[PDB]
């Protein structure tokens, strides 16, 4: 054979977990929609398409600096008039089963969710049902094992670093309302702890802090919090009052004569919440 004995090769890797979704019915061909962003080796382990579809969230970059550091950040896709469950940007382990319609989506994606959210009972139930469903032995068993192995590999990559970050001294993050004189913030740190390691990593990659103390310099990106966290999870709600207007101009004459080529401020609502602290740059 061509390749050296073993010698693990090096190539790109699709990173979004949902890329592994495939129809257990081998006789039914299926292709999941993945944004090309999935092939960027970055902190994101979900592609733009899955992110928008499932969490109502869009990625975004925040320049930081002399040396222009780029901090990852997500933004709301939640409209102004959405209410209740619609406001759950990222459901908690106690609500994801309901927020996400497990019945309406594929069994493989349901397993993916019950893996991300640490639901061993549901994972085992799905595994046993697939064992006793369809031609499990022929190829469905191997497909299920492949999907499970991929998800577990991603989770094993993430969780150790997540735990090290949790116990880390140099880098500290606090997901709550920096306005301690507020009621919608609560024990945001406790809820973040309740979240899974991979979910915690996603939250870190998505929600930027309201303030950021680097060594001795503090940068205040907001005088307010654009999202909150409660038992339900990450909620796209204004902690103090009326919801922020989210036009959603895309995706799902004299005025212009004056307003020809002309700097325009985006109407997007980025995610700003909590306090972050760091020593040195670590970049």
Partner 1 sequence: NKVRTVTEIVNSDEKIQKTYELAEFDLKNLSSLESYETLKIKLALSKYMAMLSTLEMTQPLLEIFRNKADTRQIAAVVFSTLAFIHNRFHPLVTNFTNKMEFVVTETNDTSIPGEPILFTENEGVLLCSVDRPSIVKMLSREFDTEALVNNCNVRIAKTFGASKRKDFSITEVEATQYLTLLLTVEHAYLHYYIFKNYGVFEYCKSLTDHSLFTNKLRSTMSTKTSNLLLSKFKFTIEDFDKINSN
Partner 2 sequence: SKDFLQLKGTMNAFYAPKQRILSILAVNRLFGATETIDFHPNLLVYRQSSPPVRLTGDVYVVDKNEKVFLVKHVFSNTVPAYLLIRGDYESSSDLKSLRDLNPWVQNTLLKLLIPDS
Task: Give whichever of 16 and 225 is closer to Zn ion, judged by the CB atom.
Answer: 16
Binders of partner 1 in range 208-267 (CB under 8 A): 260-261
Task: Give whichever of 47 and 225 is closer to Zn ion, judged by the CB atom.
Answer: 47
DSSP β-bridge partners for residue 228 = 235
Task: Give whichever of 38 and 130 is closer to its own copies, judged by the CB atom.
Answer: 38
- Minimum Å gap between C-beta 258 and partner 2 is 13
CA torsion, points 27, 32, 33, 38, in degrees to nearest 10?
-140
Say how many Å lie between the first and final Cα of the chain, rounded: 42
Judged by CB under 8 A, does residue 224 bind its own copies?
yes
Judged by CB under 8 A, does residue 42 bind its own copies?
yes
Among 11, 41, 63, 67, binds partner 2 (CB under 8 A): 67
Judged by CB under 8 A, does residue 261 bind its own copies?
yes
- Minimum Å gap between C-beta 217 and partner 2 is 14
CA distances from 74 to 216, 245, 254 (A): 26, 17, 35
Contact 241, 232 (CB under 8 A): no
CA 25, CA 241: separation in Å to the nearest integer? 48
Binders of partner 1 in range 7-26 (CB under 8 A): 7-10
Judged by CB under 8 A, does residue 259 bind its own copies?
yes
Burial of 179 (0-12, 13-18, 19+ CB in 10 A): middle
Task: Give whichever of 67 and 250 is closer to partner 2, judged by the CB atom.
Answer: 67
* Angle subtended at Cα 211 by Cα 206 and Cα 215, rounded to the nearest 5 degrees: 110
List interacting residues with partner 2 (CB under 8 A). 67, 280-281
């Amino acid at each position: 054979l061509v390749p050296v004995g073993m010698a693990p090769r090096q190539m790109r890797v699709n990173r979004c977990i949902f890329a592994s979704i495939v129809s257990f019915d081998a006789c039914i061909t299926y292709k999941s929609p993945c944004s090309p962003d999935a092939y960027h080796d970055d902190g994101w382990f979900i592609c733009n398409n899955h992110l928008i579809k499932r969490f109502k969230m869009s990625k975004m970059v925040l320049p930081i600096f002399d040396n222009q550091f780029k901090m990852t950040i997500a933004r709301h896709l939640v409209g102004n008039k959405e209410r209740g469950i619609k406001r759950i940007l990222i459901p908690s382990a106690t609500n994801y089963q309901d927020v996400f319609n497990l019945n309406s989506m594929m069994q493989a994606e349901q397993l993916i969710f019950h893996l991300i959210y640490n639901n061993e009972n549901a994972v085992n139930t799905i595994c046993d049902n697939l064992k006793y469903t369809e031609g499990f032995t022929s190829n469905t068993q191997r497909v299920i094992h492949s999907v499970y192995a991929t998800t577990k590999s991603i989770l094993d990559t993430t969780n150790p670093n997540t735990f090290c970050s949790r116990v880390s001294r140099d880098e500290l993050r606090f997901f709550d309302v920096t306005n301690a004189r507020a009621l919608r913030g609560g024990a945001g740190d406790q809820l973040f702890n309740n979240y899974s390691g991979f979910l915690q990593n996603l939250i870190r990659r998505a929600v930027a802090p309201e303030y950021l103390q680097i060594d001795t310099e503090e940068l205040r990106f907001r005088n307010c919090a654009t999202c909150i966290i409660d038992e339900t999870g990450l909620v796209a709600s204004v902690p103090d009052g009326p919801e922020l207007y989210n036009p959603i101009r895309s995706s799902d004459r004299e005025l212009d004569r004056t307003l020809s080529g002309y700097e325009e401020y985006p109407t997007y609502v980025p995610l700003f919440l909590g306090y972050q602290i760091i020593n040195s740059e670590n970049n």
